[PDB]
From a paper:
GIPCs contribute to the endocytosis process by tethering the cargo proteins on endocytic vesicles to the motor protein myosin VI. The transmembrane receptor PlexinD1 contains a C-terminal ‘SEA’ motif that constitutes a PBM and interacts with GIPC1.
The structure of PlexinD1cyto in complex with GIPC1 is similar to apo-PlexinD1cyto, except in the C-terminal tail that binds GIPC1 (see details below). The two PlexinD1cyto molecules are placed at the opposite sides of the GIPC1 dimer and do not contact each other. As expected, the PBM interacts with the PDZ domain in GIPC1 in the typical PBM/PDZ-binding mode, where the PBM forms a short β-strand to pack in an anti-parallel fashion with strand β2 in the PDZ domain. In addition to these canonical PBM/PDZ interactions, GIPC1 makes extensive contacts with other residues in the C-terminal tail as well as the two preceding helices of PlexinD1, resulting in a large interface with the total buried surface area of 2072 Å2. Notably, Ile1918 and Y1919 in the tail of PlexinD1 plug into a hydrophobic pocket formed at the junction between the GH1 and PDZ domain.
Author numbering:
A (entry chain A), D (entry chain A): 1345 to 1361, 1389 to 1655, 1668 to 1679, 1697 to 1809, 1819 to 1925
B (entry chain B), C (entry chain B): 56 to 216
Write the structure that this text describes.
């Protein structure tokens, strides 16, 4: 029962830094018949390769067409054409060749290192689409179990509510460096008729009540997506101290202590909450002002020990994940990855680039770094789960280890002894792909056509096109200049069919002028 | 849904009438028809000026660009107001159908302080005295008459949302 | 001349259709009719927003506020132009019926210097070569191709005034 | 064949410092049915005395309702109600009483001294309407002959084209004080088939050719209104010096002389134009740069002589005019003047103001100074004639003499010996009016109704009302406050019928709000 996101939200969240692209269109009925035919005609243009390629090149020669914009067009395109992924891939390959031809002067090992062109973002989105199946069927579960394993592990120790520093972590910059006597507590909590009648929730002596409330919310909502949980500040917490009395417990009230100007957040220890205490849950910061646990060359052994102990706990979970990501399920091999890696090798040979290490870099820069590193750092892209600052800092260490495994060569000493074996795994992976029988254009296109067909009515392509047309407007004379320059565009009168759209979208034939 | 447009020749003519048009070529044909000219004689059309103004060129559809939202009666309220200042700070118009409501509430005013009085609220009574038949200027008169330093009572109705 | 307006209840409803209205009281009656409500239930109407925005209140007639002036072909002209600069300084669109004309003449330009070329002038030929069938971007192309340092000839037509 | 203006232009020119008020209405067909009923309803309001009186009082209590505005409302009103002069007079009398009651504290001799209130301008317009008949039937001809007599007289001497100073004048500040040898010339001028074949035009040696051209234009256009004349700069002038040659004559050309930096305007003398010279006329300044004749305690006798000689020439013409203005034609006496003067005496007695000199002042301040002085200074109000700076300066002297005759008590020494006899005439006039049998309200109202009826379709009252409504808008809450204050206005629900108009004119019932 892993809380996977449905494909349209996965796409939405990884394509953009997007409610409009999943619902209806916001064009008033005033100009609705007008823009209806406008977008229709513009879709025909976007699917005309002799247009779209010029259209992208032209836009990319304008200095005020920022990187932020280039990535927007790419994602807008991926959505606009998501029903025609065969065609979309055709365009991406063409634009990738153009990108390689442009970088024929530069060092080959620098290809696809960053995402600063339309095709590079396109490539990332392509990878997102093709790898989503891998997530759903293979990688998602070990990824998720790891996340759980991290959460459970960090919670076996104190965590500072303000700074996020915990006793246990993978990240040495997040070590709670106070030697805090943490006393575990088993609470007996009830909810307002929700779930089971009473649960045994484990908490620490040192937990603020927001922290205790979060732990109780986890205990009562295991089989539910996070987006449906009550927020910790949407629930109250009573303590049945006896049969005659009960008290509301808060992080801050008339009993909170002040030390050197700052107010100390209330903890279970503060209220002298006893072991076994029965609670009831119901529906209902300026660091210079407050504090929790942190009263304010070489790592002392116990801090190193704690980095090791949490490394140790997570290690099987972590291996399982890296194995899932860097291995071929013989059941169903990675067709799209084979297809693209072969395209890389193909383009490499056409230019006499045979250096095994350069090819390794191209593949690494195409899939593990494009896709997987951002997934590890952002599990909120894949699952309906809480994003917390600390767990992200742990995933940062892990993502770094992944990055290092795909490489060829202080804070990097923790996973240092596992990186060689990971490199072997990555290299073995790349080889395994190079060994599996190649797939024809026909087979790939059949697979792509299936992705298109599966997720037909997910995205509002009209809205996507409408956004693309805005760029098409802002550079209308440049686009026109670029179509006039291209022999094939003029021969087919694409200049007319372009302005035909501009006239319709603007409801004004006089939005089409020429200088002389 | 039949639209009718008024028409003249830019150099001077009587006013002809033209039925709604889909594209610009059909317009010229219709204009030429109404003035008995070959349609190839029309050069271009302008809006609300006979002058050759290219900022007033007509190159698209014209039509009703208006969506009308109607607000129905919703929740009935009854609030107390302590008239501490001379000005309550509200503005009152009416819908031209017997109901007078709040068009504005001046910021910082006595009424602006009351959570349960919002704009677009119909005023039905003042101390249980109905305001039926009362024009907006007669309603505002009654309010200003009210004793300063005492509390009065409004019966209100919010539009449904 | 029948006007048709689109209509919703501000709190949510399907879209009803309403025929043109003379005063505001008739409007409410028509709205209530289309949604099967007693007409005394309507408080007020807003335009292009469901929100209670008193700046978008609808308290008058709506209708075609547009007078369409058509410009007919008038005087034929033939002028010489010496292309001394790279830019002639004119802008060319077309009426969507085969005629392409001058929408703008940039101040200080080569064309701006010529008294007998004004805005809204149709261009019929370039050196006696007709421009029938030529889109506005194809006409501007022909002009830029013309030899810099030589004289060309335009056949023009002013709209009648 | 006196070139009188038609009544609507006379009205237009004296009511305002007004093409819109003689033609059609500029309200678009967009809001035409809307404003149609708006103005209709507003006319009903304006004709409701219980509204109009409050409406005027309310507007006059606003500090930013300037004097310029007050006079505009008055003239707008006179035009709006010109078809209902009985009612209009009724309003003016009511507002005049209010104006007298307000000035019950001040000195009685100060009444109607200036025009700084709505009723005072109304009064002037009233006088204009009622006196126009006098102009057409009695005063106009002697006034016109005088103007001709002045023009003819000044032209017997040199006139400087730049400064306007002439040899002959009534105004000592306009004396050409150069002793210029002026030689008269008889020219034989022809026009392009216009009028007679050749005319004998008289000109001076010293005339610039613009001046000569103007003299020829007068000679060829006697029986025609000035507004139809060719302008002097719209005609060329050739000189047939012989049968072999002719030359174009200009104020300035390649033969013009320069003296001390400035160019001297060409004169007949400059071209050595001989006596009898034949010319042909056809259709075709910075004082530091150019000059004409003026090369740059007690009046020397010859300048006094010239003031006397032109005084002498005009004296019979001038007496005739002053007699026409200050006398009762027994044929048809001045009904409107009798009617109003009696209203003055009536209001005077009601307040025990019996001082004969105070009453004299009231009458003087009501008609001779309100109307006649401005007519003398502005003959362009009455006739289609040229307005020249110098003749206006002569009429200034004459107007001053008129002013002095209506009074009771250096530059005023010229007509000094005629003023006593003029005073006798004025006093005799006032008495003659006080002696003629009084006319009933009935008779006056029948006479007014006839003026209304005669000039029915002259003025666009809709446009006049529309302008009045603008003021009615700008002070809508003040007007509303003033109607609420008045017992009779509230009793008749004028507040409603006012806002009913505002809603119609603005096409917006929500242009009607109230504060509380």
């Amino acid at each position: 029962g892993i809380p996977f996101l449905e494909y349209k939200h996965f796409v939405t969240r990884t394509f953009f830094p997007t409610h409009p692209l999943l619902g209806e269109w916001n064009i008033p009925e005033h100009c609705r018949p007008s823009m209806e035919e406008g977008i229709s005609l513009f879709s025909s243009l976007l699917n005309n390769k002799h247009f779209l390629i010029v259209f992208v090149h032209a836009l990319e020669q304008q200095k005020d067409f920022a990187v932020r914009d280039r990535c927007s067009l790419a994602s807008l395109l991926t959505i606009a054409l998501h029903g025609k992924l065969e065609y979309y891939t055709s365009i991406m390959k063409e634009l990738l060749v153009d990108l390689i031809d442009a970088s024929a002067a530069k060092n080959p090992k620098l290809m696809l290192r960053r995402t600063e062109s339309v095709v590079e973002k396109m490539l990332t989105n392509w990878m997102s689409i093709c790898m989503y199946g891998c997530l759903r069927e293979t990688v998602g579960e070990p990824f998720f179990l790891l996340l759980c394993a991290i959460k459970q592990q960090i919670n076996k120790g104190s965590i500072d509510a303000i700074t996020g520093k915990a006793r246990y972590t993978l990240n040495e910059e997040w070590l709670l460096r106070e030697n805090i006597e943490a006393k575990p507590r088993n609470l007996n909590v009830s909810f307002q008729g929700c779930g089971m009648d009473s649960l045994s929730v484990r908490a620490m002596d040192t937990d603020t009540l927001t922290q205790v409330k979060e732990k109780i919310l986890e205990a009562f909502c295991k089989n539910v997506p996070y987006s449906q949980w009550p927020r910790a500040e949407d629930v109250d917490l009573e303590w049945f101290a006896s049969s005659t009395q009960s008290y509301v417990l808060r992080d801050l009230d008339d009993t909170s202590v002040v030390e050197d100007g700052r107010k100390k957040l209330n903890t279970l220890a503060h209220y002298k909450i006893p072991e076994g205490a029965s609670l009831a849950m119901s529906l209902t910061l300026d660091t210079e002002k407050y504090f929790h646990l942190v009263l304010p060359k070489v790592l002392p052994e116990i801090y190193l020990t704690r980095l090791l102990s949490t490394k140790g706990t997570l290690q099987k979970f972590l291996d399982d994940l890296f194995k899932a990501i860097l291995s071929i399920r013989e059941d169903k091999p990675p067709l799209a990855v084979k297809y693209f890696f072969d395209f890389l090798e193909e383009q490499a040979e056409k230019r006499g680039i045979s250096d095994p290490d350069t090819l390794h870099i191209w593949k690494t820069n195409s899939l593990p770094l494009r896709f997987w590193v951002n997934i590890l750092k952002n599990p909120q892209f894949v699952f309906d789960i809480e994003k917390t600052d600390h767990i992200d800092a742990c995933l940062s260490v892990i993502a770094q280890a992944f990055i290092d495994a795909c490489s060829i060569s202080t804070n990097k000493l923790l996973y240092a002894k596992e990186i060689p074996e990971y490199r072997k795994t990555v290299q073995r992976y790349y080889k395994q792909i190079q060994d599996m029988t190649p797939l024809s254009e026909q087979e790939m296109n059949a697979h792509l056509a299936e992705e298109s067909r599966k997720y037909q009515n997910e995205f509002n392509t009209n809205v996507a096109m409408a956004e693309i047309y805005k760029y098409a407007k802002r550079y209308r004379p440049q686009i026109m200049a670029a179509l006039e320059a291209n022999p094939t565009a003029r021969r087919t009168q694409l200049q007319h069919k372009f302005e035909q759209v501009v006239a319709l979208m603007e409801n004004n034939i006089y939005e089409c002028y020429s200088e002389a | 849904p039949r639209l009718v447009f008024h028409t003249q020749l830019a150099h001077g003519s009587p006013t002809g009438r033209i039925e709604g048009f889909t594209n610009v070529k059909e317009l010229y044909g219709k204009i030429a028809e109404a003035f008995r000219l070959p349609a190839a004689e029309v050069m271009f059309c302008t809006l609300n000026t006979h002058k050759v103004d290219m900022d007033k060129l007509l190159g698209g559809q014209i039509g009703l660009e208006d969506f009308i939202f109607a607000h129905v009666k919703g929740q009935r309220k009854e609030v107390e107001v302590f008239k501490s200042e001379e000005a309550l700070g509200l503005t009152i118009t009416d819908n031209g159908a017997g109901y007078a409501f709040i068009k504005r509430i001046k910021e910082g005013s006595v009424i602006d302080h009351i959570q349960l009085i919002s704009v677009g609220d119909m005023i039905e009574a003042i101390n249980g005295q109905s305001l039926l038949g009362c024009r907006h200027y007669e309603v505002a008169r009654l309010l200003k008459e009210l004793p300063r330093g005492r509390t009065f009572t409004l019966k209100l109705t919010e539009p449904r949302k």
